[PDB]
């Protein structure tokens, strides 16, 4: 019932332009939990099953079976955006703490928050 | 000439729904410089002149005197998104390193990172 960091929602990302990821697809909540409770928006990262294995240090793999996907997929920590919460359709699952640690790490690389 | 972290571009964020920020407005590039050089997208954070003082730990102020702005503004590190580079029109300015340290900090607060 509350939006928590690490939750996997199905959400409507369209319309998009060019290389932006759109459609209705799984996304992961990456905003801190204070913003998730009180802000009118959430910050998410997109999941695509267009690749099933990672090719980039900012990519994180999600098992299809464990996290209720149709296909083995990957979190694109380079494809992130702020959504009005009305964009969140369905909450599918939520990531393990160890998967959120790989997500934290990939977000630091993608956003230039470490060294490098 | 290359897109750099800390560069402030004019970009088209439209169309949006509800509480998402849209329009054609300044943004600060927050993606790393390896990604800014080779990927077809950048990650930006939106700037508003609807407020001139910060009200949230994920807000960072920009002063009209230092940067090519229309008004004293504030960076909203909760309104961030990935944009295809064709969405970037003009390069306006770039932030100081000291101002970028405040950006990093609010980004760690905004995104639930502590390291």
């Amino acid at each position, epitope marked *: 019932d509350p939006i928590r960091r690490g939750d996997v929602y199905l959400a409507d990302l369209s319309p998009v332009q060019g290389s932006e990821q759109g459609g209705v697809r799984p996304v992961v909540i990456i905003q801190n939990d204070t913003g998730n409770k*009180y802000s009118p928006t959430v910050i998410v990262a997109a999941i695509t099953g267009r690749i099933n294995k990672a090719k980039i240090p900012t990519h994180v793999e999600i098992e299809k079976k464990k996290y209720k996907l149709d296909k083995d997929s990957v979190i694109l920590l380079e494809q992130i955006r702020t959504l009005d919460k009305k964009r969140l359709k369905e909450k599918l699952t939520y990531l393990s703490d160890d998967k959120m640690k790989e997500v934290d790490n990939a977000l630091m690389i993608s956003l230039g928050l470490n060294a490098v | 000439d290359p897109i750099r972290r800390g560069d402030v571009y004019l970009a088209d964020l439209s169309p949006v729904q509800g509480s998402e920020q849209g329009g054609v407005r300044p943004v600060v590039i927050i993606q790393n410089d390896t990604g800014n050089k080779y990927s077809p997208t950048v990650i930006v954070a939106a700037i508003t002149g609807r407020i001139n*003082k910060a*009200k*949230i*730990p994920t807000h960072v102020e920009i002063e009209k005197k230092k940067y090519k702005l229309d008004k004293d503004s504030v960076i909203l590190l909760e309104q961030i998104r990935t944009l295809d580079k064709k969405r970037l029109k003009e390069k306006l300015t770039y932030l100081s390193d000291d101002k970028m340290k405040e950006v990093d900090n609010a980004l760690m607060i905004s995104l639930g990172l502590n390291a």
Partner: nanobody
Amino acid sequence: VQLQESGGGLVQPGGSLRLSCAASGFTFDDYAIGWFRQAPEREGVSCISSSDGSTYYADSVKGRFTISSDNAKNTVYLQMNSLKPEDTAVYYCAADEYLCTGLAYSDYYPGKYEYDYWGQGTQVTVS
């Protein structure tokens, strides 16, 4: 833009009160409203966000106070039960776009942020 409160006064410990805050010259759904208090430092007590109705309560009044809103009368109420003498203070209602996420952030990050609209304050004495 005016915030007129009411409901303050003297009460015996263990009693209850209902404070009111009346909003005037803004859009009730475009602003978040809450309650601050100051005993002879200024702390935020409660807040209610326009959309979603998400509430914030300071820890020292959790379970004891209750905030609510009547969108027709543009009025926020603060129902204070089981009142303690530590609650004795001047209670101000305030309004801002970020007041609620700001009040919650101040539990984790030290800050000093100015918010837009402030009321006159009403004295709440518990003795």
